Design a protein around this ligand. Structure first.
Ligand SMILES: CCCc1oc(CCC(=O)O)c(C(=O)O)c1C
Ligand SMILES: CCCc1oc(CCC(=O)O)c(C(=O)O)c1C
Length: 569
């Protein structure tokens, strides 16, 4: 029995949680009650299996069972069988489910609901997160849940909870979104590009983090990590969590052979141990390391070694280059590796290979400078404009690049891209590139998966599917879509009401940014000069109307003077 297997390994508490997440992720629209129902029914069945490992259908695979249990509450998907049936669900996951925004009751109600029923208050948290983020890294969701519990458990018995809980909950919402985004990139890499693409990413990333580890060690770590994510991304949450535990054990047992910063991590609870290991900083770089040119460009055996085991050889190149460049972003290292490979492919087919591939490092110089100049520029701009204005600048840029993309996606993607400014610019040159460019890769992947749902721009498609590692350079190279036909104004789109006054300070900027997008789509060829001079107007329209006697009509009146002056510029 497979269910029995995993149950013992995970226990009843984790087993129940993971199954709840699996269900909320497949059928995101179904109510909490129903999932809870199916979870218990499934959990009890598991209990009978532990005992009689041949009872009902304890012989079956998790998918069969899980699928049949969901099919008692959903249709075409359920008509199919085994493989096809499961693939069906995976394809129907919704990255942008039409779910009501989630509002949180006053501190008092929460603590009551938490204290009264603790298991229920937590199961609902997992449910509400899993259904909105169909790809959240399961094992990590269990880690946030405990952290969530610790928040209430501590803050509800204090002097002023509002002050103690609200903050800690915000820190959790944000970090939970970042995590969700990082994991969405991992699944997309695996699902749209193949495991080879993910392995390459892992080697480079783990080699930067574990500089002292041996190639054969990193390779072992990479092979295992790949399996973990291959399972979590395919919906095999139980085995994923299981496998992820093993990997954490291994790493801790063999610390000395991997990194010296793993100590603090291995001295804590499972869930906290895994999370800690995944986020540990880079170990110090080994002292006396030879020059890369030695074994990779000067040696005359290059082509022979490349021919013998193209995969191991390139893998070794990446590890060697990555380990000594924690200052480079993972995508840049992958671009370098791609450049080196392309060179051996053509060069090793020449008369004198050596001569041909002798200057490959001169091919790197341009690739290393592009990212550095981009970062240097944009951080200088960020420092001058501040976050809000920087996001506006990016908003104008991206809309002009890909005007067809829906206004909600553009606004979300641009705001996020703009956060790269606060998140990375404060770091010194040395750590800026990994921070900025790898973060940009997560954000642009967001754009790509949201866009794939309803394609409207061949330019977004091409840049999203051509190369995983070149996405950022592809997007940056775009300027203005010259074939784009300007949109025609819509009264409703630019009519500001008094309801924007109740909305939070941020919910306002968001509205103004939404208006800026619509503007740009209407006047692509407009300049940043006019745009600014118009934005400041909208600001005025809010302050007036919002504080001017009983006026819900000012919105139509003040809005009239607005559009009038807006149609003029
Ligand atoms: C095996 C090395 C430690 C490690 O690293 C990662 C990826 C973190 C990242 O993406 O940078 C994980 C994980 O995904 O669970 C673990 C465990
Ligand atoms: C901090 C980096 C974020 C960033 O900055 C730019 C402006 C580049 C330029 O000045 O051309 C882009 C982009 O064009 O896509 C991105 C992404």
């Amino acid at each position: 029995s497979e269910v029995a297997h995993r149950f013992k390994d995970l226990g009843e508490e984790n087993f129940k949680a993971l199954v709840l997440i699996a269900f909320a992720q497949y059928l995101q629209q179904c109510p909490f009650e129903d999932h809870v129902k199916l979870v218990n029914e499934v959990t009890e069945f598991a209990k009978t299996c532990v005992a009689d490992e041949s009872a009902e259908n304890c012989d079956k695979s998790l998918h069969t069972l899980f699928g049949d249990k969901l099919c008692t509450v959903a249709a075409d998907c359920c008509a199919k069988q085994e493989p096809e049936r499961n693939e069906c669900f995976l394809q129907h996951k919704d990255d942008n489910p039409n779910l009501p925004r989630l509002v949180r009751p006053e501190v008092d109600v929460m603590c009551t609901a938490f204290h009264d029923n603790e298991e229920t208050f937590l199961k609902k948290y997992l449910y509400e997160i899993a259904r909105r983020h169909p790809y959240f890294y399961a094992p990590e969701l269990l880690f946030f849940a405990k952290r969530y519990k610790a928040a209430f458990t501590e803050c509800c018995q204090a002097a002023d909870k509002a002050a103690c809980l609200l903050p800690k909950l915000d820190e959790l919402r944000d970090e939970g979104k970042a995590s969700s985004a990082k994991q969405r990139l991992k699944c997309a890499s695996l699902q749209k590009f193949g495991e080879r693409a993910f392995k390459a990413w892992a080697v480079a990333r783990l080699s930067q983090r574990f500089p002292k580890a041996e190639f054969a060690e990193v390779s072992k770590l990479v092979t295992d990590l790949t399996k973990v994510h291959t399972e979590c991304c395919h919906g095999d949450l139980l085995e994923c969590a299981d496998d992820r535990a093993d990997l954490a054990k291994y790493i801790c047992e063999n610390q000395d052979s991997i990194s010296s910063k793993l100590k603090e991590c291995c001295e804590k609870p499972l869930l906290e141990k895994s999370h800690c290991i995944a986020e540990v900083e880079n170990d110090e770089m080994p002292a006396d390391l030879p020059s890369l040119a030695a074994d990779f460009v000067e040696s005359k055996d290059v082509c022979k070694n490349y021919a013998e085991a193209k995969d191991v050889f390139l893998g070794m190149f990446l590890y060697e280059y990555a380990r000594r460049h924690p200052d480079y972003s993972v995508v840049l290292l992958l671009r370098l590796a791609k450049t080196y490979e392309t060179t051996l492919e053509k060069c090793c087919a020449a008369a004198d290979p050596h001569e041909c591939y002798a200057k490959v490092f001169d091919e790197f110089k341009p690739l290393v400078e592009e990212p550095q100049n981009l970062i240097k520029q944009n951080c200088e701009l960020f420092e001058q404009l501040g976050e809000y204005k920087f996001q506006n600048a990016l908003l104008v840029r991206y809309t002009k690049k890909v005007p067809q993309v829906s206004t909600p996606t553009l606004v979300e993607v641009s705001r996020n891209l703009g956060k790269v400014g606060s998140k990375c610019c404060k770091h010194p040159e040395a750590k800026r590139m990994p921070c900025a460019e790898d973060y940009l890769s997560v954000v642009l992947n967001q754009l790509c998966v949201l866009h794939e749902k309803t394609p409207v721009s061949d330019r977004v498609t091409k840049c999203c599917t051509e190369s995983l590692v070149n996405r950022r350079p592809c997007f940056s190279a775009l300027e203005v879509d010259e074939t784009y036909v300007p949109k025609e104004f819509n009264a409703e789109t630019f009519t500001f009401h008094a309801d924007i006054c109740t909305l939070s300070e941020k919910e306002r900027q968001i509205k103004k940014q939404t208006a800026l997008v619509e503007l740009v789509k209407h006047k692509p060829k407009a300049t940043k000069e006019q745009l600014k001079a118009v934005m400041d107007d909208f600001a005025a329209f809010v302050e007036k109307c919002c504080k001017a006697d009983d006026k819900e009509t000012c919105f139509a009146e003040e809005g009239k003077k607005l559009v009038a002056a807006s149609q003029a510029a």
